[PDB]
Amino acid sequence: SQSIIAYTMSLGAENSVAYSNNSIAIPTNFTISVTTEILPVSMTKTSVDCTMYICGDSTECSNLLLQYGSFCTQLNRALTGIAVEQDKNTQEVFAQVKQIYKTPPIKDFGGFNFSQILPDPSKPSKRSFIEDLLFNKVTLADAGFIKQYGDCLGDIAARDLICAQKFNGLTVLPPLLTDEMIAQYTSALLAGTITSGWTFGAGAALQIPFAMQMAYRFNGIGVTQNVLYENQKLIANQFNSAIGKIQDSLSSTASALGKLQDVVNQNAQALNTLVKQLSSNFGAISSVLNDILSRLDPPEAEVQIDRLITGRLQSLQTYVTQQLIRAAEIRASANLAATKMSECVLGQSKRVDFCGKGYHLMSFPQSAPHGVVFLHVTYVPAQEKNFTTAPAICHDGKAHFPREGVFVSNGTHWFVTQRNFYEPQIITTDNTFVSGNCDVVIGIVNNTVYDPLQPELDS
Amino acid sequence: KLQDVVNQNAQALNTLVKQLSSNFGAISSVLNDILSRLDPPEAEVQIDRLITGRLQSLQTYVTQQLIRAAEIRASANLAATKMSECVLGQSKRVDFCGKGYHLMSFPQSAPHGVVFLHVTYVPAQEKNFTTAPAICHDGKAHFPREGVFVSNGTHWFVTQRNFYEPQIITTDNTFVSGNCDVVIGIVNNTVYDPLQPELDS
Amino acid sequence: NVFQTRAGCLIGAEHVNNSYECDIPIGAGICASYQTSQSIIAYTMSLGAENSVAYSNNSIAIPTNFTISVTTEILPVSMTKTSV
Ligand SMILES: *[C@@H]1O[C@H](CO)[C@@H](O[C@@H]2O[C@H](CO)[C@@H](O)[C@H](O)[C@H]2NC(C)=O)[C@H](O)[C@H]1NC(C)=O
Ligand SMILES: *[C@@H]1O[C@H](CO)[C@@H](O[C@@H]2O[C@H](CO)[C@@H](O)[C@H](O)[C@H]2NC(C)=O)[C@H](O)[C@H]1NC(C)=O
Ligand SMILES: *[C@@H]1O[C@H](CO)[C@@H](O[C@@H]2O[C@H](CO)[C@@H](O)[C@H](O)[C@H]2NC(C)=O)[C@H](O)[C@H]1NC(C)=O
Ligand SMILES: *[C@@H]1O[C@H](CO)[C@@H](O[C@@H]2O[C@H](CO)[C@@H](O)[C@H](O)[C@H]2NC(C)=O)[C@H](O)[C@H]1NC(C)=O
Ligand SMILES: *[C@@H]1O[C@H](CO)[C@@H](O[C@@H]2O[C@H](CO)[C@@H](O)[C@H](O)[C@H]2NC(C)=O)[C@H](O)[C@H]1NC(C)=O
Ligand SMILES: *[C@@H]1O[C@H](CO)[C@@H](O[C@@H]2O[C@H](CO)[C@@H](O)[C@H](O)[C@H]2NC(C)=O)[C@H](O)[C@H]1NC(C)=O
Ligand SMILES: *[C@@H]1O[C@H](CO)[C@@H](O)[C@H](O)[C@H]1NC(C)=O
Ligand SMILES: *[C@@H]1O[C@H](CO)[C@@H](O)[C@H](O)[C@H]1NC(C)=O
Ligand SMILES: *[C@@H]1O[C@H](CO)[C@@H](O)[C@H](O)[C@H]1NC(C)=O
Ligand SMILES: *[C@@H]1O[C@H](CO)[C@@H](O)[C@H](O)[C@H]1NC(C)=O
Ligand SMILES: *[C@@H]1O[C@H](CO)[C@@H](O)[C@H](O)[C@H]1NC(C)=O
Fold this sequence. Notes:
Chains A, B, C: Spike glycoprotein
Distance between the termini of chain A: 86 Å
Oligomer: part of a larger assembly
Organism of A, B, C: Severe acute respiratory syndrome coronavirus 2
Keywords: SARS-CoV-2 virus, viral protein
Entry title: SARS-CoV-2 S trimer, S-closed
PDB class: viral protein
Bound molecules: a molecule of 2 linked components (NAG-NAG), 2-acetamido-2-deoxy-beta-D-glucopyranose
């Protein structure tokens, strides 16, 4: 009884924010959420042989293609320009630092578990458990870029894509940086983020306790660092559970990496299509170059072969154009990944939703096939409560404004607390500064401002 | 990087001139050789092969330029962003102006581009310092308003993170939050009170 | 002088254990250079000098001195305007 249904697309659950001049909502509790953002860095490096692709194993045809001249050279000049920048895209993202950092053998992070994001020497290539998942959820070509001629010759796999591309002159150039090395760049960038904080991107790596690192990344998002060490046991548990949810997200759902799988698919589809382009007749009597040479004289073959050359060359010009446009898209995502490597992983991004939803703390790079996966640690307010608020306070007749934080009331007494976490404090002259009077500020209320020096005068 | 902009633009124009020596399947690449030999009926067959190739050559060049212009525009939008956020302002973005904490940037005109001179704050000489998250004076945890807690092996000092300027730990430097039964790694240290000597008078 | 790399069989380059900065990029983590009796050498690309950060709960490194570094970043703005 299942059928196709047609519905108006929902915009999401509608939420009505209750708004009033005297109301504010401050989170009393929060959650540490690790969000997975996945960006393509590099794309498949392809070197096409345009003498081989157009004229297969043919002297008569190749002599005709040489009349076309620079066409074969200018296509490879653009494909090489891609192959160079794809190694440059990977160079700009994964290596921002000259030094390779490693975590010390003794691990005390303050409860934070990083064994999932840290490399595992047990594997043949040193990689994190997540980078092992990232490599297993993206299907690539055969292991290694060396495919023997006898492997294709001795056994012909029925409809084998990679051999057929190579016998047509389509070669996949290996990236300059192996996945084993990329895992060691992400390891160096992660080991510096863990041990040295954000200081390793602006200079020499300066070790700081990861607790103090968390404390000073709360000062960046506007949360007083005292919130950390009170919740440190919880913040480490909320974080370690969030990393544990990255496993269940990657392992169960294999479509999270589809952005990077699309990079492999489009590169394979474009090469596979380029092989299918050879079955087109181009207006010639046959698409086969050997059928024309075995039938028509060179005068009658040149007419037919030049139709094949023009089409097979335009097919390469189409492919190279598809690659240059796609390489500009991958480079834009690589420049974005290189920006999210610097400003997000290496530093702490003040940019809202640049590292994803929530106030960002630090990001963890993870090597993925033809790309990078940033694990973004974000500060998300969890439990909130409405609180009667006021812009200022009238004590002696002078308006008091918070140096940091807001004025809130629980219905009886007015308290001062920071915006992004609820930590009610007695309103004092150290918390609030004196500006102007009470005849101006709109919504101002009357409240006693405690003076820490007042009890000292009682003695 | 800017020489490549001049080279690729010159190479693409120079290649486009070399594109004219291609026969395109026609008997000759020269347009005057065909007109001086074949009748218009036999020339149109040969010339249309040259036109189709020379036009596809321009369509190839224009495509190379549109793709390259989109790359230069992306670098120009990046340069216009580094002109505003870096030169005109002070970039909080890490390694957006280059390595080091950025102060100001100096634009310099270069051929077909711009050269930003980025003034960055780079920590030079560093020293290990025994640190603690908080301090126990009367039994209430003290946290720095700005900076860190450090020790030279005897006395605990408070100083900012990005430069070493040790200061006596005081109630003006540190704020009172919570107690000492929670914070992990907290130590015991006396927090000086600037008001305390005023009560001695 | 025949050597096997991860990118493929490499003939004419000598295998050198010393990992240096990448000079002529090859692929599959291999780079080449022309050095010393001078011949082409084939070496595994070095990732940079390995630095081990000493890390502990009770340790921090604060710079006592600093340097003002002016770095030169060079970006293309405009390209040659061509009217064909
Ligand atoms: C981080 O979490 C992992 C996974 O829970 C911990 O590794 C486990 O260690 C226990 C023994 O303590 C083993 O019984 C499990 O089989 C291990 N699991 C895996 C997948 O390796 C690791 O010890 C934790 N690290 C810290 C510092 O807490
Ligand atoms: C704030 O929320 C966190 C959960 O995000 C609470 O921590 C959980 O508390 C429940 C009930 O005690 C436990 O069963 C969970 O195991 C805790 N999880 C973690 C990560 O520790 C925390 O107690 C809440 N705090 C307040 C003050 O409400
Ligand atoms: C709102 O907060 C104020 C201040 O914490 C509460 O007033 C205090 O109530 C406790 C008893 O629960 C007394 O011991 C304190 O002495 C009171 N304040 C002072 C300064 O003496 C008030 O009860 C709270 N109201 C609500 C509805 O929670
Ligand atoms: C806060 O206190 C001020 C001062 O007592 C209040 O302003 C007075 O309001 C009354 C009654 O209308 C007048 O007779 C006075 O002339 C006002 N005095 C001043 C100094 O302005 C103000 O109304 C109080 N606000 C609240 C919300 O209690
Ligand atoms: C660490 O710093 C403290 C404080 O500066 C040093 O203690 C002082 O030592 C000087 C002599 O060098 C005395 O005149 C001061 O009176 C001491 N402090 C106070 C508050 O009296 C301590 O010697 C330093 N330790 C090291 C190893 O450098
Ligand atoms: C800092 O001072 C506190 C308080 O004197 C110390 O805590 C005491 O530890 C002793 C010895 O085990 C106990 O008998 C007390 O019950 C503790 N008192 C309190 C108030 O907790 C603490 O050990 C000191 N820390 C350091 C590093 O010296
Ligand atoms: C502000 O809030 C008060 C209640 O506290 C309400 O009576 C008033 O209408 C609101 N608007 C103005 C004008 O302040
Ligand atoms: C705050 O007021 C709004 C008014 O709609 C209400 O929905 C909300 O539940 C209140 N606060 C909480 C935390 O319930
Ligand atoms: C700090 O300790 C590390 C431990 O390896 C040491 O290498 C370093 O030299 C020490 N500090 C300085 C400035 O020497
Ligand atoms: C280089 O490494 C190989 C393999 O371990 C070894 O056989 C050779 O002796 C080494 N040469 C040098 C110069 O150490
Ligand atoms: C913290 O540092 C102390 C030395 O100051 C060390 O004994 C302890 O093992 C470290 N780890 C913990 C659990 O604090």
